[PDB]
Amino acid sequence: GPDDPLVINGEIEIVTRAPTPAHLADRFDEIRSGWTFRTDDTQALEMDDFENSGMVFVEEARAVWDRPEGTEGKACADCHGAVDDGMYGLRAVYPKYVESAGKVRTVEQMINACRTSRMGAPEWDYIGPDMTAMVALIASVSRGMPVSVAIDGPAQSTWEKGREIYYTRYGQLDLSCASCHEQYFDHYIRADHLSQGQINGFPSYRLKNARLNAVHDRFRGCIRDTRGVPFAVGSPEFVALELYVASRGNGLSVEGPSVRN
Amino acid sequence: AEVAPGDVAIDGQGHVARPLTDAPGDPVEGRRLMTDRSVGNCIACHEVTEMAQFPGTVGPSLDGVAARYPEAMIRGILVNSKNVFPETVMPAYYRVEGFNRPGIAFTSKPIEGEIRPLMTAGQIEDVVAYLMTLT
Numbered sequence: 001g002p003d004d005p006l007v008i009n010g011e012i013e014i015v016t017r018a019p020t021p022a023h024l025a026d027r028f029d030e031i032r033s034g035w036t037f038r039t040d041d042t043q044a045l046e047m048d049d050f051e052n053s054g055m056v057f058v059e060e061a062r063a064v065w066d067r068p069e070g071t072e073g074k075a076c077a078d079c080h081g082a083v084d085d086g087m088y089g090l091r092a093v094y095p096k097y098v099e100s101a102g103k104v105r106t107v108e109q110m111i112n113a114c115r116t117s118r119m120g121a122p123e124w125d126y127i128g129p130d131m132t133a134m135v136a137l138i139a140s141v142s143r144g145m146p147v148s149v150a151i152d153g154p155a156q157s158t159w160e161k162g163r164e165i166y167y168t169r170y171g172q173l174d175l176s177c178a179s180c181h182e183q184y185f186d187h188y189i190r191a192d193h194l195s196q197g198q199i200n201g202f203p204s205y206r207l208k209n210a211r212l213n214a215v216h217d218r219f220r221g222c223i224r225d226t227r228g229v230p231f232a233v234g235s236p237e238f239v240a241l242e243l244y245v246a247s248r249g250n251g252l253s254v255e256g257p258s259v260r261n
Numbered sequence: 262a263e264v265a266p267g268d269v270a271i272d273g274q275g276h277v278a279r280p281l282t283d284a285p286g287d288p289v290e291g292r293r294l295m296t297d298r299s300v301g302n303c304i305a306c307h308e309v310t311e312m313a314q315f316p317g318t319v320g321p322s323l324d325g326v327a328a329r330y331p332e333a334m335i336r337g338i339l340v341n342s343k344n345v346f347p348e349t350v351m352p353a354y355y356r357v358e359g360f361n362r363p364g365i366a367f368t369s370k371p372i373e374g375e376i377r378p379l380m381t382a383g384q385i386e387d388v389v390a391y392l393m394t395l396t
């Protein structure tokens with residue numbers, strides 16, 4: 001249930017309950033992983049990587065990391081080293097402002113800029129299986145590390161944009177993210193147990209579609225299911241929402257790839 | 262006849278006394294529309310002990326709502342719940358303007374041309390008829 005400990009593989013302690021970040025203290029006593037809202041059977045799938053189907057894809061991305069791709073003849077590993085070292089901590093601090101871009105970047109945008117400008121390789125589909133499996137690999141080597149995205153400085157106006165979007169009602173059903181995840185977390189919509197709509201566990205392996213799900217994929221489907229028009233995956237709007245939603249879970253451990261409904 | 266969404270008379274309490282159609286409300290068909298996500302999607306949020314699978318708990322149980330509320334208040338809640346409960350998360354089922362990025366059902370596509378209400382006048386009267394039996 002909601003208060004039982006999440007340790008992965010007997011080794012990785014996951015902070016599933018945390019003090020609400022100061023920007024959000026108004027609204028919650030406490031921030032919680034989406035894992036704390038799941039059934040015992042679903043919860044168990046995340047307790048061991050052998051029982052976690054998302055990790056199958058993380059394993060395949062381990063091979064991809066070392067495989068040369070594109071006209072440059074280089075692999076991720078040729079610049080970043082072993083993935084456990086080169087990607088360590090990074091999932092915890094993205095989205096973030098990137099100097100070379102003069103803009104907040106997501107992990108995907110960084111991965112694609114390496115492919116096109118450093119690898120001579122084709123872009124991966126933002127929310128396609130190749131990108132989502134790599135992002136899941138990156139997340140997985142920083143599991144148990146606290147999510148710590150900056151909300152200030154060169155990141156602030158993007159964070160405010162994402163904040164605005166979080167509380168904006170969309171669609172013919174006329175609902176904001178907060179409508180459900182802030183006001184009615186812990187209630188049921190049909191059979192689904194409303195969580196706080198956190199992204200610390202992303203990409204999520206979902207029992208609904210038996211695959212990994214990218215952050216922007218979820219976001220797209222969330223606006224869609226208000227009977228609304230989603231923003232484009234990779235759009236400035238979804239980048240901004242991801243930074244803001246990420247900030248809603250600052251202090252929760254990195255859990256990706258997580259197992260959810 | 263039918264009263265169009267823009268032509269509905271709503272009092273100061275969000276109550277709508279006159280029906281949206283003068284065709285009789287089918288209590289049996291209203292029951293059906295409430296379980297369809299494509300129509301009412303009432304179950305996703307509301308318990309009705311009478312219907313007898315996995316009702317939501319965002320909205321209150323609707324058991325005995327006819328006993329606490331006038332028909333006019335019940336219709337009003339269905340025309341535009343916000344008139345009756347300000348800032349409610351309950352969708353507005355007979356509104357056709359004032360939205361933000363509305364799309365065609367769950368297709369992710371923008372609505373082009375006029376907005377049809379989430380439910381027709383007949384669908385609302387079917388559902389009102391059914392809620393009136395929950396005494």
Ligand code: HEC
Nearest residue numbers: 074075076078079080090100107110111114115118119134
């Ligand atoms: C194989 C497809 C990959 C993947 C998955 C990543 N890289 Fe790279 N990387 C390189 C350089 C010079 C940077 C800094 C670029 C900048 O400042 O704009 C990066 C950055 C990244 C990140 C962000 C890292 C961070 O610390 O914030 C990520 C997640 C990432 N990369 C993933 C250099 C190279 C290469 C040089 C030839 C190669 C090849 C790759 N990277 C390949 C990959």
Ligand code: HEC
Nearest residue numbers: 034175176177180189192193194195197198204222223260
């Ligand atoms: C119609 C009500 C509704 C609205 C509005 C809504 N969601 Fe959700 N959301 C749900 C339900 C139901 C679930 C699945 C149960 C849960 O919360 O874990 C879910 C799940 C999620 C998850 C998965 C959490 C996890 O632990 O894997 C995320 C992230 C999320 N929502 C973000 C958002 C965002 C961003 C928005 C605004 C675009 C939004 N939600 C708006 C109903 C809603």
Ligand code: HEC
Nearest residue numbers: 301302303306319320321326338346349350351352354388
């Ligand atoms: C997005 C969630 C949601 C959906 C979908 C929804 N409702 Fe509601 N409903 C609510 C909430 C929440 C209230 C209580 C008012 C409040 O506090 O917002 C309510 C109130 C009501 C009431 C007044 C009951 C009372 O005791 O206060 C009735 C009747 C009702 N709803 C019927 C319906 C019908 C009929 C439908 C389908 C057309 C429906 N609801 C769909 C959330 C919802």
